[PDB]
Amino acid sequence: MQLHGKMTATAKSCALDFLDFVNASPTPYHAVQNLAEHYMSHGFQYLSEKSDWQSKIEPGNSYFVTRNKSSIIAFSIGKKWKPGNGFSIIATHTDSPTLRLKPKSQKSAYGYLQVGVEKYGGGIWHTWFDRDLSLAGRVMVEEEDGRVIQYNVHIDRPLLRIPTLAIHLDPSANSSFSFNMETEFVPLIGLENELAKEETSDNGDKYHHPVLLSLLANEISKSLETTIDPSKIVDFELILGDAEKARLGGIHEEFVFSPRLDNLGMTFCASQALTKSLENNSLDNESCVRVVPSFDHEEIGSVSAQGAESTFLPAVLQRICELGKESSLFSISMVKSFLVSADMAHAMHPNYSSRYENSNTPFLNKGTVIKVNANQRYTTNSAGIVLLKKVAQLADVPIQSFVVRNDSPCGSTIGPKLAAMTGMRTLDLGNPMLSMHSCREMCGSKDFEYAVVLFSSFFQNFANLEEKIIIDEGFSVACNTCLKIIRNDSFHCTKCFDFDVCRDCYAKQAFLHPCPKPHFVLVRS
Amino acid sequence: MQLHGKMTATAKSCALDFLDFVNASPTPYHAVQNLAEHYMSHGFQYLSEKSDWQSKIEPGNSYFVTRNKSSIIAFSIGKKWKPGNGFSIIATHTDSPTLRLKPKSQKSAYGYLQVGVEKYGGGIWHTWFDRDLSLAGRVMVEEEDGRVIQYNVHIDRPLLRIPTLAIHLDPSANSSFSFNMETEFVPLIGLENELAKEETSDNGDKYHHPVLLSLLANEISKSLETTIDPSKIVDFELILGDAEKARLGGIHEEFVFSPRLDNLGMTFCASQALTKSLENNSLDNESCVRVVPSFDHEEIGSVSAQGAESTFLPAVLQRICELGKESSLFSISMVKSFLVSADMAHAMHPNYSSRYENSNTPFLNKGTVIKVNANQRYTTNSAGIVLLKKVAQLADVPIQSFVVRNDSPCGSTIGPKLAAMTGMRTLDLGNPMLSMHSCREMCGSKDFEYAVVLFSSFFQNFANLEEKIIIDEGFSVACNTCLKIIRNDSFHCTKCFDFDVCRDCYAKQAFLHPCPKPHFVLVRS
Amino acid sequence: MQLHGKMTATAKSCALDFLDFVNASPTPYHAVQNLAEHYMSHGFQYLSEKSDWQSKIEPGNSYFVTRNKSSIIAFSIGKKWKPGNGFSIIATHTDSPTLRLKPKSQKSAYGYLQVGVEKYGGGIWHTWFDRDLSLAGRVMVEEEDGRVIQYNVHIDRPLLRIPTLAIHLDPSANSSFSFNMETEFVPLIGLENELAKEETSDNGDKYHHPVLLSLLANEISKSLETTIDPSKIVDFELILGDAEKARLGGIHEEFVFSPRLDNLGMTFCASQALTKSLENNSLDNESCVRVVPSFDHEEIGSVSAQGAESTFLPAVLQRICELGKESSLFSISMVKSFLVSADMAHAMHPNYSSRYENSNTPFLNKGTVIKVNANQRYTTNSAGIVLLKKVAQLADVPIQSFVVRNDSPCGSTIGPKLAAMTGMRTLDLGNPMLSMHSCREMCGSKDFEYAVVLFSSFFQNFANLEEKIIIDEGFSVACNTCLKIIRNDSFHCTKCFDFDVCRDCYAKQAFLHPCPKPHFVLVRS
Ligand SMILES: [Zn+2]
Ligand SMILES: [Zn+2]
Ligand SMILES: [Zn+2]
Ligand SMILES: [Zn+2]
Ligand SMILES: [Zn+2]
Ligand SMILES: [Zn+2]
Ligand SMILES: [Zn+2]
Ligand SMILES: [Zn+2]
Ligand SMILES: [Zn+2]
Ligand SMILES: [Zn+2]
Ligand SMILES: [Zn+2]
Ligand SMILES: [Zn+2]
Structure with missing residues (x-):
């Protein structure tokens, strides 16, 4: 694990753990x-939401619930928790701006097979041009007894591409690039001159390309004992993402170049720190419930059945609060609770410095960012700032602040509306990044470790610091196993990229990584 | 109390009581x-929302609850009230369009100290130029044991100013005045050539001016036994308002010139008439609950934790309805209830008569205004109109009506969305005014007394008139103490402005006003 | 008298004396x-200009003359003055951009009483919107023998207002605010629904509102033994000014927020320093005549009977020079004389820094400003600069310099044309300020004391320094009484604002201020 400078061997390992997470999660x-x-x-x-949780949940244990297999709420109940105590909630969203396949996605023009796509969210759509695009999503498959089950499919290869026109044919594209959102934004799946195994149709106008359905059925059948014919595929959501793996960038690997950084970065940080806040025994002394909801559909405004504005978070919180017998315990628990809407913040763009307020704009790898907006597009008030300044004091991590320019529009996060349906005190924070809603996105690599430390400290120290805020009273190489800079010979895996176990761990046989047999050459100093 | 003409000595006294309220309430x-x-x-x-109200609230008494110290809901429960009976609700909002200090508010340019501000709401921003601006808000202060409490601070002096460019330097400003919302909209706090008590920093880039933090700590310490050093100030919301006191205007004092008239006047009218509807004994015969919620964040759309679209009003109404044992009593009580969204209406502007519908536009001092809109930006239907025409018949006050022009946009109030989360029948009314969302705002002075009389009659006569609407069935000087025109010698306080007690009250020693020792000269006729 | 920092207790007292002057002088x-x-x-x-001054003026005394009760020329003749000696002249102007009532000022639209106003000067007219406006001016009153005399009337209350349209009805006003100079710029005096004491006219189309004439007659009769009926009012000039009192602003009270700062600032400084240059005995040794003319109509170009371009200054100077018998003594005295056209200068605007020349732009509270322009819109030459640099050296006050940008227009002051009709060497100076010709204007507070010290030094040392320039030869609390920082208990007037007499002056009974009986509470340290 190469450490170029000021690298601390844990921020890199936390960032490398993010890279495995986001490369396996395109949908x-x-x-x-x-x-x-x-x-x-x-x-x-796992908790089924169809079941009744009166006898299924008990204090001291951790549970998670799932809606539509696309929103997940995980919560850990402390041992000293009574019904009526507060909640420490860190809410993210799992979705990103992308392109979905149409229901009639079959398109053909001039010998080329195309897919008909439709835009999702406010993506920066010129960045999707000339990219290797992968295809992923969930596929409904019929089986012989009539039941239909959901199969997640990943096609990890360059499969689609939206190509630009050459510059010889339109030299005005360098002056200003504009494109029609149908006719010039159609990706290419392949060529139809070489699929002539059968030159018939046998029924007019199939919904998708039969070669596409064959690949979907083949990719599913790789993970099953049986095989799936393409005729049993009923319907799917298929997401086009950037096919290229996320990996660290910069002169010192201080950047993270990745698709879907809009909250795949905070979801990773919120979910890791929920598990990191159970390490020694933080339960058996916790009096609250630590909730991490990862929502869906936040790029279009959360108005869905599994979005943040749905009843998914309030019904889960009521079902936790219905362990007690008093019916008023839900509204009591909300005013003792706190929400952290973990959504990524705009870092300082050096090339576009005029589109930023010059004193309240954060920087990469300088800590997570408290997003403050007067119009409450970000719903941070001062009561939240004092709490998370105390948390950052306890965690010993830096925090920054962000406002937009007054001559600039601002988009609401899930934080304002999750505050509305809960009545819960809340703050909108996130880690800084550039080129938000692009096809490929850039953030700092130290910022992942800073967020996890802050959030685990927020989870572990919420109950003590919540009662201290008084509103409303009466009137150059390290080892991937042990994260330490080694001082001796290094065993370099020639089959992975930067694995590099140490002296002790080489004899300790702790070199588990995605290489079935690694070759460790031993290297001086 | 000078009465110029048709003045009735109670409309002026109600308007003068508003002037004391709005001058003390800039945030x-x-x-x-x-x-x-x-x-x-x-x-x-006072009710803490952290507590359980099963044993704390009982019929015949009055309670109020507060969220974030910026939204307040006051309710009076009638003695004859059962759980399941309706609610008579008059909802206002406490906020106004203004400028908030940024988290990094320190700005300096060419020897001038500036503060970095950010816009709140849809204010008319050219009216903020060349105004004496005061600074107010809440300040979080650390104390020695670690707890942080909220201190409201008012700086009642001309402290900030946004100056225009002189007309010699840009003569085109008289043709059309436009300005960049950062670079030309920065107020001035002072000059840095004369704060040179220490010419160091001791840490790079403090968030605010240290001279500003010294004034905030000094203004806080005026109301405390101890002193506050500026280092213990953690974070604040600071509001820039117009520094100039609200006072009556016009040839006959028939206007009210005031900042923050956007519902400050209705919040005064709704809260006064809630207390005025308890005078003789309106409780001990009331079968409903009279609620006055004064919300926050309504100028940006109420999407917050304490806004109107929050759970603040529905959770309070459910906790009142949870005194009964049946769980369906909340939904039963909503269809017997009624909401009055008291938000101010557009009066007729004589200079801009083409931007008004010439027959449905109200006038100043002609009564409160029923705001009707087909697109339900104002959610008034006919069932509400018949109820409040009957209320105005009982109160003997005039009411008017307002619609917008069809070629004009209309902005939603809190009334449509409070109707949605409650299912409650509702009407949007308010008193007429001109220059809404300006820095200084104008309304009529008789209109304050007309609103209080109407609302107290709405509170006192709701239960009788609610069952009469059948939808959904089966198939020249007066005295400030006694508000009477005197007919004899007048005792004029030479220390106040227009105090003027009478013959009887001079011997009755009832001359309490903000002058520690008044001099009453006696005046003929 | 609160001294926040670097405050010297005399600059504040000079600025507080200005505040009393400009609040009492709106016309x-x-x-x-x-x-x-x-x-x-x-x-x-007082000198009547109808009289002959051959036997009325003598050396060693001070005189003043008045034209149209709106231009005043005060001059002090030194004891050692001979006819033929020079003049030390500091010329200001008394007028400011404002709105005058029309001769037929009665307007009514949609129940509102309006007054028809007409613009005066190049005012920044969008700053007049949404302001409390007072009414002031001179009124011609007939008496019973037919003679007509002039009465100055001040109506010190919010009496008029020009209201903006609400932002809901025209959202384009935030992009660029423009307004028609009749139809949308009509102030409002009151409502006509409540003046129905008589519902007749008795003659078609009176010139003004009868309720306005009643207030003018009532405000006049307050200062007279008799009463005035409104029928005897013949005609008036009535000026709309900002109704709000001038008062110190800023974090350290280093700003002066005031209406009419265009030369009420310099007239105050020129008139005070004329009297300050007589304190010990500056006469009995003065060989020149110290003239302070305060002109009228300078915002429209001084082309009037009492303006600067009138014969008012040359006829007064000739009548002084006609004490001698030689007829050539006037032209001899002009080349030994010097003019200071005291008109306010543009300070540096931090928000509009591009509309300024970055090296020749002055700053607030850094001394008075030598206005230099090549096109002689300001008529400063080098012969004047050397004289007033020597004066500033003697007075020990800083001076700055101003030029306009070359891509910017410049407006002439009275200095160029007063130079033309006299042939007198001259300089245009003034104190720096921002937002010139606005409704409310901002300047520094130390700048008033710097101007008075400079001008009194110019008056006292003119004769010595005029012969040294060789052109054309042969080939935290202080006391308001004693301006000293006190070191002991302070007696705080609870009835005034910031009066605060000291230990010695409390026993000395020197506490005369506008409070008929003050209460002095004694305060530690
Ligand atoms: Zn996002
Ligand atoms: Zn997003
Ligand atoms: Zn390997
Ligand atoms: Zn190791
Ligand atoms: Zn409003
Ligand atoms: Zn509003
Ligand atoms: Zn008084
Ligand atoms: Zn009385
Ligand atoms: Zn001027
Ligand atoms: Zn001027
Ligand atoms: Zn006093
Ligand atoms: Zn004294």
Whole structure:
């Protein structure tokens, strides 16, 4: 694990753990799937929302619930928790701006197979041009008894591309690039001159390309004992993401170049720090409930059945509060609670410095960012700032602040509306980044470790610091296993990229990484 | 109390009581503070929302609850009230369009100290130029044991100013005045050539001017036994308002010239008439609950934790309805209830008559205004109109009506969305005014007394008139003490402005006003 | 007298004396009236211009003359003055941009009483919107024998207002505010629904509102033994000014927020320093004549009977020079004389820094400003600069310099044209300020004391320094009484604002201020 400068071997390892997470999670369906595997690895229990939780949840244990396989709420109940005590909630969203396949996605023009796509969210759509695009999502498959189950599919190869016109044919594109959002924004799946295994149709106008359905059925059948024919695929959501893996960038690997950084970065930080806040025994002394909801559909305004503005968070909080017998315990618990809407913040862009307020704009790798807006697009008030300044004092991490320019529009996060349906005191924070809603996005790499330390300190110290805020009273190489800079020979895996176990861990056989057999060459100094 | 013509000595006294209220309330924090002192003066009890109200509230008494010290809900429960009976609710908002200090508010340019401000709401921003601006808000102060408490601070002096460019330097400003919302809209706090007590920094880039923090700590310490050093100030919301006191204007004092008239006047009218509807004994015969919620954040759309679209009003109404044992009593009580969204209406502007519909536009001092809009930006239907025409018939006050022009946009009030979360029948009314969302605002002075009489009649006669609407069935000088025109010698306070007690009250020693020793000269006729 | 920092207790007292002057002088008629009361308090004698001054003026005494009760020229003749000696002249102007009532000022629209106003000067007219406006001016009153005399009237209350349209009805006003100079710029005096004492006219189309004439007659009759009926009012000039009192602003009270700062600032400084240059005995050794002309109509170009371009200054100077018998003594005296056109200068605006020349732009509270322009809109040459640099060296006050940008227009002051009709060497100076010709204007507070010290030094040392320039040869609390920082207990007047007499002056009974009985509470340290 190469450490170029001021690198501390834990911020890199936390950032490298993010890279494995976001490369395996291109859809909210995959994001929820990867979070829930991490939750059950750390001892969480799945709760069916169809069931009744009166006898299923008890203090001292950790649970998670899932809606539409695309929104997930994980909560850990402290042992000293009574019904009526507050909640420490850190809310993220799993979705990102992208392109979905249309229901009739079959398109063909001039020998080229195209797919008909439709925009999702406010993406920066010129950044999607000339990119290797992968295809991912969930697929409904019929089985022989009539039941239909959901299969998540990842096609990890360059499969689609939206190509630009050449500059010879329109030299005005360098002056200002504009494009029609149908006719010039259609990605290419392949060529139809070479699929002539059968030159018939046998029914007019299939919904999708049969070669696309064959690949979806083949990619599903790789993970099953049986095989799936393409005729049993009923309907799907398919997401186009950037096909290229997220990996560290910069002169000192201080940047993270990644698709879907809009909250895949904070979801990772919120979910990791929920599990990190259970390490020694933070439960058996916790009097609150630590909730991490990772929502869906936040780029279009959360107005859905599983979005943040849905009843998903309030019904889960009421079902936790219905362990007590008094019916007023939900509204009592909300005023003792606190929400952290973890959504990413705008870092300082050096090339566009005029589109920033010059004194309240944060920087990369300088800590997480308290997003403050007077119009309450970000719903941070002073009562939240004092709490999270005390948390940052306890965690010993820096925090920054952000406002927009007054001649600039601001978009609401889920924080204002989650505050409305709960009545819960709240703050909007997030880690700084540049090129938000782009196809490929950039943030700092120290910022992942700073967020996890801050959030785990927020989870562990919420109950003590909540009663101290008085409103409303009466009147150059390290080891991936042990995160330490080594002082001796290094064993370099020639099969991975930057693995580099140490002297002790080489004999300790702790070199588990995605290489089935690694070759460790031993290297001086 | 000078009465120029058709003045009735009670409309002026109600308007003069408003002037004391709005001059002491430049922030929603101060507005809630002044309302709650008026509530506890009239016998209301504070309710902590952290507590359980099953044993704390009983019929025949009056209570108020507060969220974030910036939204307040006061309710009086009638003695004959059962859980399941309706609510008579008059909802206002405490906030106004203004400028907030940024988190990094320190700015300096060319020897001048500036503060970095950020816009709140849709204010008319050219009216803020060349005004004496005061600074007010709430300040979080640390104490020695770590707890942080909220202190409201008022700086009642000309402290800030946004100056225009001189006309010699840009003569085009008279043709059309436009300005950049950062670079030309920065107020001035002072000059830095004369703060040179220490010419160091001792740490790079403090968030605010140290001279500003010294004034905030000094203004706080005036009202405390101890002193506050500026280092213990953690964070604040600071509101810039117009520094100039509200006072009556016009040839006959028929106008009210005031900042923050956007519902400050209705919040005064709704809160006064809630207390005025308890005078003889309106409780001991009341079967409903009279609620006055004064919300926050309504100029940006109420999407907050304490706004109108929050759960603040529905959770309070459910906690009142949870005195009964049946869980369906909340939804039963809503269809027997009625909401009055008291938000100010557009009066007729004589200079801009083309931007008004010539037959449905109200006038100043002609009564409160029923705001009707087909697109339900104002949510008045006919069922509400018949109720409040009957109320105005009982109160003997005039009412008017307002619609917008069809080629004009209309902004939603809190009334439509408070109707949505409650299911409650509702009407949007308010008193007429001109220059809404300006820095200084104008309304009529008789209109304050007309609103209080109408609302107290609405509170006292709701239960009788609610069952009469059938929808959804089966198939020249007066005295400030006694508000009477005197007919004899007048005792004029030479120390106040227009105090003027009478013959009887001079011997009755009832001359309490903000002058520690007044000199009453006796005046013929 | 609160001293926040670097405050010297005399600059504040000079600025507080200005605040009393400008609050009592909203018209040039009131300005001349307040100057002349200050002149006769300091021993000046009134001269009728109808009389002959051959036997009325003698050396060693001070005189003043008045034209149209709106231009005033005060001059002090030294004891050692011979006819033919020079003049030390400091010329200001008494007028400011404002709105005058039309001759047919009665307007009514949609129940509102309006007054028809007409613009005076190049005022920044958007700053007049949403302001409390007072009414002042001179009124011609008939008496029973047919003679008509002039009465100055001040109506010190919010009486008029020009209201803006609300932002809901025209959202484009925030992009660029423009307004028609008749139809949308009509102030409001009151409502006509409540003046129905008589519902007749008795003659078609009276010139003004009868309720306005009743107030003018009532305000006049307050200062007279008899009463005035409104029928005897013949005609008037009535000036709309900002109704709000001038008072110190800023974090350290280093600003002066005031209406009419265009030369009521310099007239105050020129008139005070004329009287301050007589204190010990500056006469009995003075060989020149110290003239302070305060003109009228300078905002429209001084082309009037009492303006600067009139014969008012040259005829007064000739009548002084006609004490000698030689007829050539006037032209001899002009080349030994010097003019100081005291008109206010543009300070540095931090928000509009591009509309300024970055090296020749002065700052607030850094001394008075030598206005230099090549096109002689300001008529300063080098011969004047050397004289007033020597004066500033003697007075020990700083001076600055101003030029306009070359891509910016410049407006002429009275200095170029007063130079033309006299042939007199001259300089244009003034104190720096921002937002010139606004409704409310901002300047520094130390700048008033710096101007008075400079001008009194210019008056006292003119004769010595005029012969040294060789052109054209052969080939925290202080006391208001004693201006000293006190070191002991302070007696705080609870009835005034910031009066605060000291230990010695409390026993000395020297506490004369506008409070008929003050209560002095004694305060530690
Ligand atoms: Zn996002
Ligand atoms: Zn987003
Ligand atoms: Zn490997
Ligand atoms: Zn190791
Ligand atoms: Zn409003
Ligand atoms: Zn509003
Ligand atoms: Zn008084
Ligand atoms: Zn009385
Ligand atoms: Zn001028
Ligand atoms: Zn001027
Ligand atoms: Zn006093
Ligand atoms: Zn004294």
